[PDB]
Write a protein that binds this ligand. Structure first.
Ligand SMILES: O=C(NNS(=O)(=O)c1ccccc1F)c1ccccc1
Ligand SMILES: [Zn+2]
Length: 269
């Protein structure tokens, strides 16, 4: 009845949530997706015919980041409507709270790919409203299950703040976050803040300006690190250089990151 398994690239992936693909696409045992243009198909035969014909080998839009074989494409929902709609229906298989699939024009989509000789292979993405009334620098963020917990979510989170910095603005992901989303942002925030308190008298407003993390996300992060005191109605940073290093040395920050190299980012607001 609902779509419950997809084939994309060389992966078969079980669905986590309902996504409103048309009814007759549900009925099939599997839905088959072109990993490059994200067209969804009902049959292994139409899929293999499509694979032989389709000329795309990367996302549409502008490649705004390239370092070695990690690429980000910026895709405007108005310019590439069908691709963005396909991406949103794919995303909704793995996001409980996403509600927007068809009215994609207000959004820009940042698609993360990993490149080999065959083409640029989609790992995940984040959407962003062109005009956010609430200052959200991410709408939805999704990493395909076989790539989760492997560094790519940290990359996209970092990337979303590097855009916010180029915008001279603070930003926060739209709520609610998934369970993994919550843990991932808290861990990203903790690292960035701890490294700034090592590398540098920084105030909370100072840190917000340096990182584009909102003051509230800074404060909730420092509270979970027990690194803020409260005085006459104001949160104030309170931490020893040694306690910062204790946190940074811990086993949580020990996996080598895919880092966003701002030299390789090509973008203006
Ligand atoms: O895959 C995910 N997180 N684990 S991670 O990338 O190794 C990671 C490691 C350290 C800090 C933040 C991270 F994100 C993820 C999936 C969906 C939304 C957001 C993140
Ligand atoms: Zn295709």
């Amino acid at each position: 009845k609902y779509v419950d398994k997809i084939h994309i690239g060389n992966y078969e992936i079980d669905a986590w949530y309902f996504s409103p693909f048309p009814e007759d696409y549900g009925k099939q045992p599997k839905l088959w997706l072109c990993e490059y243009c994200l067209k969804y198909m009902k049959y292994e035969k139409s899929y293999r015919f499509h694979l032989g014909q389709c000329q795309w080998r990367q996302p549409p839009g502008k490649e705004i980041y390239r370092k070695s074989n990690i690429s980000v494409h910026e895709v405007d929902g108005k310019d590439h409507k069908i691709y963005c709609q396909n991406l949103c229906l794919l995303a909704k298989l793995f996001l409980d709270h996403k509600t927007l699939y068809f009215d994609v024009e207000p959004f820009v989509f940042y698609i993360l790919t990993e490149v080999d000789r065959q083409g640029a292979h989609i790992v995940g993405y984040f959407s962003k409203e062109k005009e956010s009334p609430d200052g959200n620098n991410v709408s939805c963020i999704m990493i395909l299950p076989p790539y989760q917990r492997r560094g790519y979510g940290r990359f996209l989170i970092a990337f979303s703040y590097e855009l916010s910095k180029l915008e001279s603005t603070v930003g926060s992901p739209e709520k609610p976050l998934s369970d993994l989303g919550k843990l991932s942002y808290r861990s990203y925030w903790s690292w960035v803040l701890l490294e700034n308190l090592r590398d540098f008298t920084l105030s909370i407003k100072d840190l917000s300006q340096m990182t584009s993390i909102t003051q509230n996300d800074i404060i909730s992060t420092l509270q979970s690190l027990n690194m803020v005191k409260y005085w006459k109605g104001q949160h104030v940073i309170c931490v020893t250089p040694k306690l910062v290093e204790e946190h940074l040395k811990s086993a949580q920050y020990k996996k080598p990151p895919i880092t966003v190299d701002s030299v390789c980012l090509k973008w203006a607001p």
